[PDB]
Amino acid sequence: HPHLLAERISRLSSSLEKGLYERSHAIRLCLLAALSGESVFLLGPPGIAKSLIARRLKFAFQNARAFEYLMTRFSTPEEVFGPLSERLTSGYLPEAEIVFLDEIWKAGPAILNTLLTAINERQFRNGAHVEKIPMRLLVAASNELPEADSSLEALYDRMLIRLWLDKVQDKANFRSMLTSQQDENDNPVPDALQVTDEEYERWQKEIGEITLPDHVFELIFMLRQQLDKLPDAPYVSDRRWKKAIRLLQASAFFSGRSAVAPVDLILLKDCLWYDAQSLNLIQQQIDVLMTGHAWQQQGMLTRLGAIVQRHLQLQQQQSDKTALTVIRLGGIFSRRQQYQLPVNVTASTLTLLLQKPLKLHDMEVVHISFERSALEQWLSKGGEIRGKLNGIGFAQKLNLEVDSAQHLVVRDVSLQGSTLALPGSLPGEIKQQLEELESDWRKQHALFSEQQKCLFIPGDWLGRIEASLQDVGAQIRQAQQ
């Protein structure tokens, strides 16, 4: 039933989107805002359908009056809210469900103040008595952002969603928009889809009942702390956070869920920035949160390395079972030449464990990886041989010698020797742990795919998450070989 809802909202949004190019997200967000009692600020140059998409949204509702107004510096509350005879509000802001106000940052202090009470109190001072405004969606537009310490910032910071728009970029889209016979002022929404007053009011109550899971909160709180520590990060007030949380709830509700999901958190990318520099910072931070923490990605990778560590540890604990017998090569040469095993060892770079781990280059080393090519020439021509300690870092020079028993022995600064062994020809402890992790990964991936079907999230983000989960899965599958 709420799953028929996700179907309906999607179908509703689809129709509202007809004839509009490169504005999909913007329409879904304004719909989400309109259905959740939030407001949205549209930033961009003139003639890019900012007003149009605002007028479009009145067609989401059966009974919905729209109010449009362009702010001038000489604009008075009489023009915006109605002139008093007590006040004549018919055809003005005080009785419209969708209000669009263009060129917002030039509203005077008198308008500014009565707007702030309009957004907060959903009330209006009608001379004598105060009356509740039916305003469901407010949308404000401008080509610029308000001044640094402006009066208007209080208004800006009271408008949850921020969208930065531009002229159509795709050549094909330009042509389609250019030749579109779509009457832009006609109702494109089928009667059945339009939301009723009875529905609107019920949903307002139900959105508040959507739960906020522990992991979801932890992520939000993590980001709040993260932003705080970064000096460039925009200041996000508690007011902003609370209003952002309702949008998150609304997203979930209209996506057929009873709980805010980690995917809903992407929407914060449309709430937390106030300028250009802060937009980039927000996007990066949320991206890091989404690809790293939201589906336990980095947490599973830190578990993975812990297992791979144990695997190596068990590999060197069973390194008595193996040594490495270098085969003598005869012929006619000046040195006692040596040879690697014909095809037994053919790995381009092979790693060798040591029976007695040694302190080499101020660290204890359990395994040394050689470029097989470099080990060849040293076994033949002698000289000096390098090898990356514990597989990592630079190829360090080594005190290596061919043993009488035909083994390879590394020495430390105490001249302590250690025989080198090749890895085993998968232990039960590792198989158990690595299967638990794979199960956990599958459960994570399952959760993501079962929730990525979310109207209010742009496709590109979902791509990045899916990739980040594939990365972990690939790393674990390579670990079980």
What does each C-alpha distance from 12 to 36, 250, 254, 438 come to in angstroms?
15, 16, 12, 39
Angstrom distance (rounded) from CA 407 to CA 370: 15
**Residue 461 is a binding residue for ligand ADP (CB under 6 A):** no
**C-beta separation of 387 from 398 below 8 A:** yes
**Residue 213 is a binding residue for ligand ADP (CB under 6 A):** no
Is 69 labelled a binding residue?
no
Tell me the helices (H) and strands (E) count for the chain, helix number first: 15, 16
Q: What is the largest CA-CA distance in the chain?
A: 117
Cβ of residue 138: shortest distance to ligand ADP, in angstroms?
15
The span of 46-54, 196-204, 356-364, 386-394 binding ligand ADP (CB under 6 A) equals: 46-54
Distance between first and last Cα of the chain: 46
Identify the bridge partners of residue 41 per DSSP, sorted by sequence position. 140, 162
Residue type, 45: P
- Tell me whether residue 375 is exposed, middle or buried, using C-beta atoms within 10 angstroms of its C-beta: 0 to 12, 13 to 18, 19 or more: buried
Strands (E), 109-189: 123-125, 130-132, 137-142, 161-164
3-class SS at 340?
Answer: coil
Q: What is the DSSP letter of 236?
A: -
Angstrom distance (rounded) from CA 169 to CA 264: 27
Is 307 labelled a binding residue?
no
Contact set for ligand ADP, span 80-109 (CB under 6 A): none
> Which one of 6, 52, 308, 447 is in contact with ligand ADP (CB under 6 A)?
52
**Residue 177 is a binding residue for ligand ADP (CB under 6 A):** yes
> Which one of 9, 17, 33, 50 is in contact with ligand ADP (CB under 6 A)?
50
Residue placing its CB nearer to ligand ADP in the complex, 47 or 342: 47
Residue placing its CB nearer to ligand ADP in the complex, 52 or 308: 52
**Residue 140 is a binding residue for ligand ADP (CB under 6 A):** no
Cβ of residue 13: shortest distance to ligand ADP, in angstroms?
15
Is 374 labelled a binding residue?
no
Residue placing its CB nearer to ligand ADP in the complex, 175 or 224: 175
The span of 17-25, 359-367, 397-405, 409-417 binding ligand ADP (CB under 6 A) equals: 17-25
> Which one of 12, 40, 43, 48 is in contact with ligand ADP (CB under 6 A)?
48
**Residue 66 is a binding residue for ligand ADP (CB under 6 A):** no
Contact set for ligand ADP, span 182-201 (CB under 6 A): 184
What does each C-alpha distance from 299 to 136, 303, 306, 309, 469 come to in angstroms?
42, 6, 11, 16, 12
Residue type, 364: E
Residue placing its CB nearer to ligand ADP in the complex, 140 or 421: 140
Binding residues for ADP: 21, 47-52, 184
Q: Which residues are annotated as a binding site?
A: 21, 47-52, 184
Q: Interface with ligand ADP by CB under 6 A: which residues?
A: 19-23, 46-52, 168, 177, 184
